[PDB]
Amino acid sequence: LEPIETASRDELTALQLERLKWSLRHAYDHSPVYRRKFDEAGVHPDDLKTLADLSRFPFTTKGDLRDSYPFGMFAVPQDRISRIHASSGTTGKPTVVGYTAADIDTWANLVARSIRAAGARRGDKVHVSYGYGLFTGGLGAHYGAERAGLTVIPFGGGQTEKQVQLIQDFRPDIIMVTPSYMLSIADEIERQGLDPVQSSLRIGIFGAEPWTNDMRVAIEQRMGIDAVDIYGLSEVMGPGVASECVETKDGPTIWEDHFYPEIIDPETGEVLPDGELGELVFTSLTKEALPIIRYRTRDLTRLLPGTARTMRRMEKITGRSDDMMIVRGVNVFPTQIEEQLLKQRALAPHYQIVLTKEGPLDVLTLNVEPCPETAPDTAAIQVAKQALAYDIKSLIGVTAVINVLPVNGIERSVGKARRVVDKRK
Amino acid sequence: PLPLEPIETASRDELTALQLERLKWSLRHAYDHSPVYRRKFDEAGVHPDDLKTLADLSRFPFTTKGDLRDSYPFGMFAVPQDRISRIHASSGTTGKPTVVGYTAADIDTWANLVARSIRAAGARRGDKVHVSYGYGLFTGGLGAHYGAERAGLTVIPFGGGQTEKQVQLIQDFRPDIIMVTPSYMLSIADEIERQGLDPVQSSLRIGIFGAEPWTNDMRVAIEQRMGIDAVDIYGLSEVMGPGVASECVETKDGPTIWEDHFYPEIIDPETGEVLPDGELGELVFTSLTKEALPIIRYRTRDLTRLLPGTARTMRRMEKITGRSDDMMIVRGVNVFPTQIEEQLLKQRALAPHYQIVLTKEGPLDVLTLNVEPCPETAPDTAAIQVAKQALAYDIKSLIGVTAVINVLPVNGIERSVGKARRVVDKR
Numbered sequence: 031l032e033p034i035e036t037a038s039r040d041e042l043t044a045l046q047l048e049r050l051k052w053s054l055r056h057a058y059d060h061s062p063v064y065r066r067k068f069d070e071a072g073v074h075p076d077d078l079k080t081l082a083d084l085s086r087f088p089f090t091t092k093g094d095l096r097d098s099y100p101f102g103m104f105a106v107p108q109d110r111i112s113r114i115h116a117s118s119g120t121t122g123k124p125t126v127v128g129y130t131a132a133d134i135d136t137w138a139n140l141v142a143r144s145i146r147a148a149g150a151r152r153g154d155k156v157h158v159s160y161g162y163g164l165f166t167g168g169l170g171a172h173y174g175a176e177r178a179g180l181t182v183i184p185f186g187g188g189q190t191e192k193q194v195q196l197i198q199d200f201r202p203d204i205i206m207v208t209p210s211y212m213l214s215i216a217d218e219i220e221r222q223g224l225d226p227v228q229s230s231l232r233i234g235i236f237g238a239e240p241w242t243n244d245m246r247v248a249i250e251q252r253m254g255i256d257a258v259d260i261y262g263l264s265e266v267m268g269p270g271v272a273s274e275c276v277e278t279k280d281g282p283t284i285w286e287d288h289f290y291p292e293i294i295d296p297e298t299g300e301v302l303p304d305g306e307l308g309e310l311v312f313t314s315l316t317k318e319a320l321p322i323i324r325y326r327t328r329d330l331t332r333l334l335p336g337t338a339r340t341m342r343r344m345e346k347i348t349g350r351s352d353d354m355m356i357v358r359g360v361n362v363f364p365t366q367i368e369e370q371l372l373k374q375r376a377l378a379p380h381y382q383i384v385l386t387k388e389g390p391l392d393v394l395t396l397n398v399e400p401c402p403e404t405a406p407d408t409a410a411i412q413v414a415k416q417a418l419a420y421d422i423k424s425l426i427g428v429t430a431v432i433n434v435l436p437v438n439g440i441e442r443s444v445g446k447a448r449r450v451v452d453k454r455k
Numbered sequence: 456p457l458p459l460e461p462i463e464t465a466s467r468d469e470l471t472a473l474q475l476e477r478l479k480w481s482l483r484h485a486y487d488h489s490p491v492y493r494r495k496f497d498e499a500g501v502h503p504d505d506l507k508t509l510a511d512l513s514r515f516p517f518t519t520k521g522d523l524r525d526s527y528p529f530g531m532f533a534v535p536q537d538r539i540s541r542i543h544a545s546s547g548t549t550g551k552p553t554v555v556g557y558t559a560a561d562i563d564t565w566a567n568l569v570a571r572s573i574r575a576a577g578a579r580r581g582d583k584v585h586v587s588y589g590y591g592l593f594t595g596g597l598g599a600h601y602g603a604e605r606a607g608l609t610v611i612p613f614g615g616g617q618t619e620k621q622v623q624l625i626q627d628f629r630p631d632i633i634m635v636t637p638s639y640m641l642s643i644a645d646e647i648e649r650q651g652l653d654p655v656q657s658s659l660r661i662g663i664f665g666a667e668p669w670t671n672d673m674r675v676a677i678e679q680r681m682g683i684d685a686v687d688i689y690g691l692s693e694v695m696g697p698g699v700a701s702e703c704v705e706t707k708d709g710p711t712i713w714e715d716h717f718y719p720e721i722i723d724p725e726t727g728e729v730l731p732d733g734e735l736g737e738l739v740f741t742s743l744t745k746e747a748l749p750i751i752r753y754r755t756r757d758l759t760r761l762l763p764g765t766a767r768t769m770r771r772m773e774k775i776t777g778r779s780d781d782m783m784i785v786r787g788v789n790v791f792p793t794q795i796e797e798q799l800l801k802q803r804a805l806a807p808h809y810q811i812v813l814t815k816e817g818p819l820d821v822l823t824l825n826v827e828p829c830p831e832t833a834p835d836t837a838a839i840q841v842a843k844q845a846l847a848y849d850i851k852s853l854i855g856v857t858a859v860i861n862v863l864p865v866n867g868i869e870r871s872v873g874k875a876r877r878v879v880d881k882r
């Protein structure tokens with residue numbers, strides 16, 4: 031481990047304060063957007079005397095980045111930008127980010143830290159299935175595994191049959207991949223009559239989208255691995271903003287020596303005490319090219335005390351604020367549905383939620399599949415469909431039309447699964 | 456200009472001496488640590504210390520594709536697993552992909568040689584590089600990426616596909632250099648023109664095109680269309696990846712081989728005899744500095760000739776004529792797709808897109824050349840008729856081959872995303 035990972039909280043705090051002061055000054059001096067934002071908010075970098083003072087400073091939102099496209103957020107000259115990446119476009123036009131060579135180095139060290147936290151060992155191979163390209167996931171995973179001194183197998187997305195061929199042949203110890211795509215790889219392993227538990231894989235590091243504890247336990251049992259959660263977003267850096275320690279599996283530990291977290295009430299912008307659910311906000315402490323100050327992530331979670339590290343954790347992401355569905359008056363996230371689906375051993379872990387209107391009433395249709403083994407077993411499927419409907423009603427408050435499709439009926443994820451098709455318009 | 460390394464123009468005497476020392480090391484490393492080379496050298500009755508000068512290299516046995524295939528996945532490796540930093544693979548063009556590995560030192564060298572290649576293309580401080588080569592197990596994309604990043608440039612790691620979006624980002628990000636296959640460049644150019652833009656007025660100044668053969672005539676065509684300088688970069692996964700050799704933009708006289716790291720020979724592919732420089736034959740490489748996968752006298756199956764250094768001390772290769780695998784035998788006459796390309800490009804009424812289809816009709820090899828009009832000339836039936844006839848005549852009179860010229864509609868030929876499939880052999 032790095033010394034900082036077990037430093038005292040006093041030591042960490044002091045380090046954060048020094049770096050936050052630097053970052054605020056760097057943004058104000060070198061990022062025209064932040065000179066304007068700070069002036070129009072009536073604050074100066076000098077106003078930060080303690081970490082609690084961060085709440086004086088304005089927020090940065092997606093809109094700020096969209097307005098400055100492509101390169102208006104940068105705080106260094108274009109000749110110092112070593113790398114361009116973009117967000118994935120999930121909510122709209124991708125936003126563009128940049129990195130100096132030092133920022134690439136920092137990112138590589140943080141992803142390496144996250145891979146260590148997952149339980150990596152000298153001699154491990156890493157099979158990277160996160161997409162390579164303008165997306166931050168693939169190249170971020172790549173550089174971090176390479177920095178960790180491991181054997182990098184840079185496969186990227188797609189070609190499921192080939193990925194399974196190479197998992198057999200190359201015997202990777204670690205896979206870095208979305209949890210939804212992991213399911214497709216697991217299916218393919220089983221489709222070929224192989225036993226996925228006996229795969230060489232020891233560790234899965236899954237991120238890029240929400241996945242429940244229930245999902246983790248299912249995947250762990252099916253693949254014979256430890257699975258840990260890695261979090262990031264492109265505005266802040268990419269994967270490796272936070273990652274779970276495999277010895278606790280209690281939500282990603284935030285690398286807050288580099289990215290300082292807050293939680294706010296999304297409606298008011300007020301800061302909440304640790305433990306309360308709301309919107310996750312980050313400020314970069316060491317970023318050169320694109321310092322980012324109080325970025326409202328639109329990801330919903332809560333901050334929790336350090337366990338396996340000095341650094342605090344986040345709870346597993348509940349969802350994006352954009353993920354929230356309002357169904358006949360009840361607010362529901364896809365993860366809530368997923369938790370109930372994963373109780374049914376007779377059903378696959380694949381799903382899609384389709385929202386419609388029938389007259390004036392909302393209708394939520396949950397499309398599921400049997401496991402391939404259970405498909406012919408009508409009695410098992412029938413119990414599953416009824417128990418799932420009863421769990422969603424009793425625990426979530428929504429009446430879900432459960433619709434069991436043939437095996438392979440649901441379009442498989444290519445990366446970030448689309449959990450929801452809202453046809454209500 | 457971005458700086459030359461001193462070795463790039465140091466004396467040939469100094470270069471020879473350092474090649475010899477590195478070759479002695481590489482042969483020992485292979486023999487001592489690669490269990491395949493221990494077997495190969497022992498069976499040929501040679502030992503590393505048989506190499507006294509560079510002229511002795513042709514005493515050593517060849518390595519072929521089959522050697523690699525027989526060693527899948529990791530049988531060629533010459534360092535322990537925990538020193539392997541990276542796995543890549545060949546593209547599968549001719550069969551099952553062959554797997555290669557790299558230590559950290561290897562990855563560093565590769566990044567240095569791709570940077571050297573990008574500098575040779577005329578890159579400048581502050582340039583943005585749009586990388587359109589595929590990212591993944593293929594060596595191209597990550598090889599280009601690391602090299603552009605090592606040169607200190609601004610890397611835009613797009614990768615393959617999504618042509619409309621690549622064009623949007625060529626507009627929005629205004630890159631200076633694009634690294635891409637010549638056949639996929641053609642698609643990008645089409646899409647620029649389709650979105651109503653003048654491709655000459657693109658921000659791009661330099662195209663660095665490899666991964667497949669493309670003629671000097673194709674070069675001049677793309678240069679005029681895009682308003683760029685276009686240079687050729689060569690590589691193959693067994694040897695390293697892209698950056699084995701790269702053209703100097705000031706001479707455009709075929710890729711200069713980085714023979715401080717990869718020592719080239721040319722052989723008669725039938726006999727294995729080494730040919731004097733200047734004669735066409737099969738290219739053969741020996742790595743001088745590689746750790747994880749030393750490769751000794753690898754028979755590339757690429758056909759070319761060696762030429763004296765011009766812009767560098769290092770020798771050049773001619774632009775690749777083709778793979779051995781590309782050669783068609785058509786009614787007793789040997790013909791390469793690049794020869795067909797040269798004639799196609801004389802026709803201003805026809806696009807630069809093509810694909811050859813080989814069938815048999817009784818005794819006859821039928822070579823059908825699928826072409827398209829230019830967008831502007833598609834409705835001009837007379838111009839297209841003359842282009843067809845003139846192209847058939849050129850192929851017959853200059854190559855000795857009867858071809859059927861099949862004019863498809865615009866977009867009738869499946870577009871390349873990387874290495875175009877030039878020949879579909881249905882015989």
Ligand SMILES: Nc1ncnc2c1ncn2[C@@H]1O[C@H](COP(=O)(O)OP(=O)(O)OP(=O)(O)O)[C@@H](O)[C@H]1O
Pocket residue numbers: 116117118119120121122123124125165166236237238239240241259260261262263264265327329346347350446
């Ligand atoms: N471990 C994870 N848990 C749940 N969500 C995750 C995790 N890792 C990443 N995400 C989601 O992915 C987002 C980062 O993705 P990225 O920056 O590539 O673009 P995006 O948010 O998908 O698309 P866009 O910003 O264009 O709408 C995070 O903010 C979060 O919503």
Ligand SMILES: Nc1ncnc2c1ncn2[C@@H]1O[C@H](COP(=O)(O)OP(=O)(O)OP(=O)(O)O)[C@@H](O)[C@H]1O
Pocket residue numbers: 544545546547548549550551552553593594664665666667668669687688689690691692693755757775778874
């Ligand atoms: N600049 C170039 N001009 C001509 N052809 C090239 C050039 N660069 C690379 N190539 C071709 O690509 C080959 C290297 O590609 P790679 O190692 O990815 O696998 P492949 O040869 O296409 O597939 P496989 O070896 O599996 O049949 C070269 O040997 C050559 O045939």
Ligand SMILES: [Mg+2]
Pocket residue numbers: 117120263
């Ligand atoms: Mg986002």
Ligand SMILES: [Mg+2]
Pocket residue numbers: 226227228229230231232253254255
């Ligand atoms: Mg296992």
Ligand SMILES: [Mg+2]
Pocket residue numbers: 371372373374375376377378379
């Ligand atoms: Mg189940």
Ligand SMILES: [Mg+2]
Pocket residue numbers: 545548691
């Ligand atoms: Mg090959």
Ligand SMILES: [Mg+2]
Pocket residue numbers: 654655656657658659660681682683
């Ligand atoms: Mg131009």
Ligand SMILES: [Mg+2]
Pocket residue numbers: 799800801802803804805806807
């Ligand atoms: Mg033409």
